[PDB]
Scaffold this motif. Structure first.
Motif, short mmCIF file in Angstrom:
data_model
loop_
_atom_site.label_atom_id
_atom_site.label_comp_id
_atom_site.label_asym_id
_atom_site.label_seq_id
_atom_site.Cartn_x
_atom_site.Cartn_y
_atom_site.Cartn_z
N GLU A 108 -2.50 -0.09 -4.55
CA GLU A 108 -2.42 -1.32 -3.74
C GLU A 108 -2.21 -2.54 -4.62
O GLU A 108 -2.77 -2.62 -5.72
CB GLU A 108 -3.68 -1.49 -2.88
CG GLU A 108 -3.74 -0.49 -1.74
CD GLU A 108 -5.06 -0.45 -1.03
OE1 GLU A 108 -5.70 -1.52 -0.88
OE2 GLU A 108 -5.46 0.65 -0.60
N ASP A 155 0.83 -1.19 0.00
CA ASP A 155 0.00 0.00 0.00
C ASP A 155 0.87 1.25 0.00
O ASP A 155 1.51 1.57 0.99
CB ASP A 155 -0.89 0.00 1.26
CG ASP A 155 -2.03 0.98 1.17
OD1 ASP A 155 -1.91 1.96 0.43
OD2 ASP A 155 -3.05 0.79 1.83
N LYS A 160 -8.15 12.88 4.11
CA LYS A 160 -8.43 12.51 2.73
C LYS A 160 -9.89 12.78 2.42
O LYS A 160 -10.75 12.57 3.27
CB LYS A 160 -8.11 11.04 2.46
CG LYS A 160 -6.72 10.56 2.91
CD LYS A 160 -6.54 9.10 2.57
CE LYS A 160 -6.00 8.33 3.74
NZ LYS A 160 -5.89 6.89 3.40
N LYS A 191 2.00 2.98 9.90
CA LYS A 191 2.14 3.90 8.75
C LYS A 191 2.83 5.18 9.21
O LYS A 191 2.77 5.49 10.37
CB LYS A 191 0.79 4.35 8.20
CG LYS A 191 -0.29 3.34 8.08
CD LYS A 191 -1.19 3.65 6.90
CE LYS A 191 -2.48 4.34 7.33
NZ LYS A 191 -2.98 5.24 6.24
MG LIG Z 1 -4.34 3.17 2.89
#
Ligand SMILES: [Mg+2]
Ligand SMILES: Cc1cn([C@H]2C[C@H](O)[C@@H](COP(=O)(O)OP(=O)(O)OP(=O)(O)O)O2)c(=O)[nH]c1=O
Ligand SMILES: [Mg+2]
Length: 377
Positions: free
Chosen positions: A102, A9, A52, A189
Motif C-alpha cells: 500500500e 492497494d 486470507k 476490487k
Molecule cells: Mg486490501
DNA sequence: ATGGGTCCT
DNA sequence: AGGACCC
C-alpha cells in the motif's frame, strides 16, 4: 488544507508476484503459504472459499485443487514493493508506504498544476476515471469535485504505469484525506478505483459494520471499545469524550473519535528508505542454546546479504524472542564491525543478548527468533 | 497466527 | 524494552 490524496492497494500482492514468476499458476487456484498459514491467495481461490490468513488445513479442505507456494522468504515481494513505491514517487516525490503493498500519495500540488493548465471550456469537459463512490452525481461547477476528478485521472495513470512497467494490478481510492482514501480504495476490487466526493463521506464511514474496520483502531482498542458498549461507528461518534479520554487516554480517544467522523489531518509522509531490516523464523519448539545459535546464524547471513545492497549500515542490533507477547534486547554494533569476516563477532553479540533474556541453565521453550538491524545512518 | 514494518511512551 | 498500530 483541501487535499487530494490517493491510496494505492495491490491486488493479492504475494500471489500476484508468484503468478508473474510462474505463469503456470496464473489460471489456477493459488495460495501463498507461510508455515501452517495461507497468508494470501489469488482471486480464483477466493471464489472457492479461501480467505486470507486461513489455516492450510481449512483451505485445502475448502479447495482440494488449491496450489500452494511458499512465501516465507519475503525477498521478492520486498523488491517488487519498492519498485511500486519508486514508480509512484516519479508522479509526486512524497509517497508514504503502508506495509509492502500500500502507498499514499498527496496529489494536491499535481492536481493544481494540471488545473492551472486547463482553459474555461476545458473544465466542461473534466471526466472521472473509474467509480464514483455511492454513485454520487458530479457537479462540475464544484471546484472540490473538479480537483477530485483530476485526482482520479492521475490515479488511473498511476495504475496504468504500474501495469505497463511492472505487470502489477491494484486498486486506488481518491479522497480528501488518508483515512477516506484508504476506506474508499477497497469499495471496488480487484483492479478498480473509486473516488469519494465530500457529500458521500458520511455514507462511506457508516457503511462500516465493525469499529475495528477503521484504520487506527486495532485489536486492543476495539476490545476496549466493546467493553464500553461501543459497537458501531455512530456509537463511537456519539460516546462521551470524557469517559473515552479516561478509558483510553487523551491521545487515543481524541484521535479515534475524530477518525469516527471521517476526519484525519495527518500528512502524507515520505517513507524514503527503511528504518530497519529484520529476518524472522517461527517454530514449534526451540529448547537448546546450540540450536538457537544455529537459528540466529541463518537469520544473520540473510540480513548481512541485505545489509549491504542498499549500501548503508545499521548502528544497532536487536534480538527478539517469543516464549511458551514478545521480549527483546538490543545494543549498539561496534564501529569496527559496522564498516561493511563479520559473522563471528556478530553472533557472540547476539548470544550475549540471548542469554540475558533466556536463562539457559534453566529449561526454556521458544517459538520465535528475530534479528533486527536498525538505526541506519 | 506469518513475516515483516511504523511511531509513541 | 514494551506496546499500540498497519500490511
Ligand atoms: Mg486490501
Ligand atoms: C495482513 C497481512 C498481510 N500480509 C501480506 C500478504 C499480502 O499479499 C500483502 C498485502 O496484504 P493485503 O493488501 O491486506 O492483502 P492482499 O494484497 O493479499 O489482498 P487484497 O486484494 O485484498 O488487497 O501483505 C501478511 O503476510 N500477513 C498479514 O497478516
Ligand atoms: Mg492488497
Amino acid at each position: 488544507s483541501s487535499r487530494v490524496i490517493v491510496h494505492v492497494d495491490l491486488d493479492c500482492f504475494y500471489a500476484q508476484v508468484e503468478m508473474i514468476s510462474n505463469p503456470e499458476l496464473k489460471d489456477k487456484p493459488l495460495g501463498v503459504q507461510q508455515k501452517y498459514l495461507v497468508v494470501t491467495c489469488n482471486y480464483e481461490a477466493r471464489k472457492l472459499g479461501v480467505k486470507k490468513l486461513m489455516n492450510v488445513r481449512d483451505a485445502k479442505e475448502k479447495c482440494p485443487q488449491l496450489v500452494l507456494v511458499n512465501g516465507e522468504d519475503l525477498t521478492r515481494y520486498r523488491e517488487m514493493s519498492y519498485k511500486v513505491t519508486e514508480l509512484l514517487e516519479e508522479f509526486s516525490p512524497v509517497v508514504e508506504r503502508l506495509g509492502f503493498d500500500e502507498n499514499f500519495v498527496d496529489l494536491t500540488e499535481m492536481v493544481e498544476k494540471r488545473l492551472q493548465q486547463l482553459q474555461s471550456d476545458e473544465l466542461s469537459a473534466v471526466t472521472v476515471s473509474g467509480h464514483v463512490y455511492n454513485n454520487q452525481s458530479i457537479n462540475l461547477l464544484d471546484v472540490l469535485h473538479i480537483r477530485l476528478l483530476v485526482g482520479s485521472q492521475i490515479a488511473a495513470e498511476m495504475r496504468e504505469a504500474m501495469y505497463n512497467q511492472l505487470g502489477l494490478t491494484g486498486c486506488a481510492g481518491v479522497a480528501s484525506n488518508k483515512l477516506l482514501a484508504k476506506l474508499v480504495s477497497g469499495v471496488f476490487k480487484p483492479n478498480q478505483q473509486t473516488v469519494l466526493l465530500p457529500e458521500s463521506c458520511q455514507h462511506l464511514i457508516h457503511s462500516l459494520n465493525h469499529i475495528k474496520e477503521i484504520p487506527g483502531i486495532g485489536y486492543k482498542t476495539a476490545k476496549c471499545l466493546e467493553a464500553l458498549g461501543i459497537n458501531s461507528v455512530r456509537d463511537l461518534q456519539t460516546f462521551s469524550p470524557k469517559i473515552l479520554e479516561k478509558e483510553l487516554g487523551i491521545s487515543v480517544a481524541q484521535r479515534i473519535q475524530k477518525l469516527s467522523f471521517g476526519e484525519d489531518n495527518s500528512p502524507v509522509i515520505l517513507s524514503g528508505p527503511p528504518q530497519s531490516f529484520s529476518e524472522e523464523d517461527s517454530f514449534k519448539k526451540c529448547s537448546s542454546e546450540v540450536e538457537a545459535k544455529n537459528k540466529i546464524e541463518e537469520l544473520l547471513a540473510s540480513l548481512l546479504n541485505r545489509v549491504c545492497q542498499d549500501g548503508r549500515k545499521p548502528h544497532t542490533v536487536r534480538l527478539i524472542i517469543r516464549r511458551y507477547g514478545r521480549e527483546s534486547r538490543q545494543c549498539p554494533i561496534p564501529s569496527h564491525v559496522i564498516q561493511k569476516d563479520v559473522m563471528t563477532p556478530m553472533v557472540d553479540i547476539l548470544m550475549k543478548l540471548f542469554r540475558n533474556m533466556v536463562n539457559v541453565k534453566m529449561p526454556f521453550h521458544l517459538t520465535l527468533l528475530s534479528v533486527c538491524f536498525c538505526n541506519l545512518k
